[PDB]
């Protein structure tokens, strides 16, 4: 999600205005102003594609943040950036392995909170406590408080 | 009268089909959501089956 | 001629809406059949959950 959310933040106002015009086509006549599988299917067919009901439900589930079963405009912008890549290929595991070693300052095999904090400060961006805590919670999937090698690869998946 | 009646019969039919289209589309989304829920409840109980089975 | 063109557009619309409602209806039937199948599976797994809980 994070790489796509960043791409959305960076869209210009004119680009968002064009996406809004497209969104309005998709939700024309919808009871709640949102895109359900009935509006998504009618547009995909209008576009020449023939998705199954399951494919349509999965396209919505991939960006549905509230659990509404529908796509709102904010969710739509994520759908539209996900449908395109600037970040093609996305590197690979061998390159992430060498980068992992650079985060692991004590060479223990894990990235701890102090290591993460040192690396974040080095970026030059203002780092708040919330930036540190949130990235470590996003990375450490087993709740030990550290990022292992396999968690690191999931953590940096798709990051250019 | 036949092309106009036709147009009106067709508008009536088109409307019946349009409503059926939207009715079936809205209800499809719901039927899909029931399938998601049906699969969801299936997974909750099937997962319990797996958990209980694992135990 | 104009009402016939009106009709052609709304007949084409009825046809699009008819095809779409048939599609959505078939898909509804299947989403519902999936839901029913998933509900049947729910029950198959719910009774087997009981068998499994009993086991």
Swiss-Prot record, chain A:
One molecular function GO term is: protein homodimerization activity
From the UniProt record, give one GO term of the biological process aspect.
Answer: transition between fast and slow fiber
Concerning SMART domains, the annotation shows: EFh
Q: What else is known?
A: Cardiac muscle Tn-C can bind 3 calcium ions per molecule. Domain I does not bind calcium.
Organism, per UniProt? Homo sapiens
| Swiss-Prot/TrEMBL keywords | Acetylation, Calcium, Cardiomyopathy, Disease variant, Metal-binding, Muscle protein, Phosphoprotein, Repeat
In its UniProt entry, what is this protein called? Troponin C, slow skeletal and cardiac muscles
Family the entry assigns: Belongs to the troponin C family.
Do the record's keywords include Repeat? yes
Q: Which residues carry this modification: Phosphoserine?
A: 97
For the ligand (Ca(2+) 1), the binding residues are 64, 66, 68, 70, 75
Residue numbers binding Ca(2+) 3: 140, 142, 144, 146, 151
Instruction: Write the lineage as a comma-separated list.
Output: Eukaryota, Metazoa, Chordata, Craniata, Vertebrata
User: What residue stretches are annotated with the EF-hand domain?
Assistant: 15-50, 51-86, 91-126, 127-160
The coding gene here is TNNC1
From Swiss-Prot, chains B, C:
For the modification Phosphoserine, which residues carry it? 54
Q: What domain of life does the native source organism fall in?
A: Eukaryota
- In which tissues is this gene expressed? Detected in primary breast cancer tissues but undetectable in normal breast tissues in Sudanese patients. Isoform 1 is expressed in adult and fetal skeletal muscle and cardiac tissues, with higher expression levels in the cardiac tissues. Isoform 10 is expressed in adult and fetal cardiac tissues, but not in skeletal muscle.
Per the UniProt entry, the effect of residue 55 to N is: In CMH3; no change in homodimerization; no change in homodimer thermal stability; decreased actin binding; recessive effect in the homodimer; increased calcium-dependent regulation of myosin binding to actin filaments; dominant effect in the homodimer
Localization (cell)? Cytoplasm, Cytoskeleton
Q: Which disease is it linked to?
A: Cardiomyopathy, familial hypertrophic, 3: A hereditary heart disorder characterized by ventricular hypertrophy, which is usually asymmetric and often involves the interventricular septum. The symptoms include dyspnea, syncope, collapse, palpitations, and chest pain. They can be readily provoked by exercise. The disorder has inter- and intrafamilial variability ranging from benign to malignant forms with high risk of cardiac failure and sudden cardiac death.
Q: Provide the domain comment.
A: The molecule is in a coiled coil structure that is formed by 2 polypeptide chains. The sequence exhibits a prominent seven-residues periodicity.
What is this protein identified as?
Tropomyosin alpha-1 chain
The organism is Homo sapiens (Human)
Q: What is the organism lineage in this UniProt record? A: Eukaryota, Metazoa, Chordata, Craniata, Vertebrata
């Amino acid at each position: 999600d994070d790489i796509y959310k960043a791409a959305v933040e960076q869209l210009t106002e004119e680009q968002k205005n064009e996406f809004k015009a497209a969104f309005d086509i998709f939700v024309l006549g919808a009871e709640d102003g949102c895109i359900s599988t009935k509006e998504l299917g009618k547009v995909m067919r209008m576009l020449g594609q023939n998705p199954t009901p399951e494919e349509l439900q999965e396209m919505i589930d991939e960006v549905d943040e509230d659990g509404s079963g529908t796509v709102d405009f904010d969710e739509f912008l994520v759908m539209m950036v996900r449908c395109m890549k600037d970040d093609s290929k996305g590197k690979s595991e061998e390159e992430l392995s060498d980068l992992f070693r650079m985060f692991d300052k004590n060479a223990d095999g894990y990235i701890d909170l102090d290591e993460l904090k040192i690396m974040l400060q080095a970026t030059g961006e203002t780092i708040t406590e919330d930036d540190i805590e949130e990235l470590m919670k996003d990375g450490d999937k087993n709740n030990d408080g550290r990022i292992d090698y396999d968690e690191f690869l999931e953590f940096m998946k798709g990051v250019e | 009268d036949e092309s106009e009646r036709g147009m009106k019969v067709i508008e009536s039919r088109a409307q019946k089909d349009e409503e059926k289209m939207e009715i079936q589309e809205i209800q499809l989304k719901e039927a899909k959501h029931i399938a998601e829920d049906a699969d969801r409840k299936y997974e909750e109980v099937a997962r319990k089956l797996v958990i209980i089975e694992s135990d």
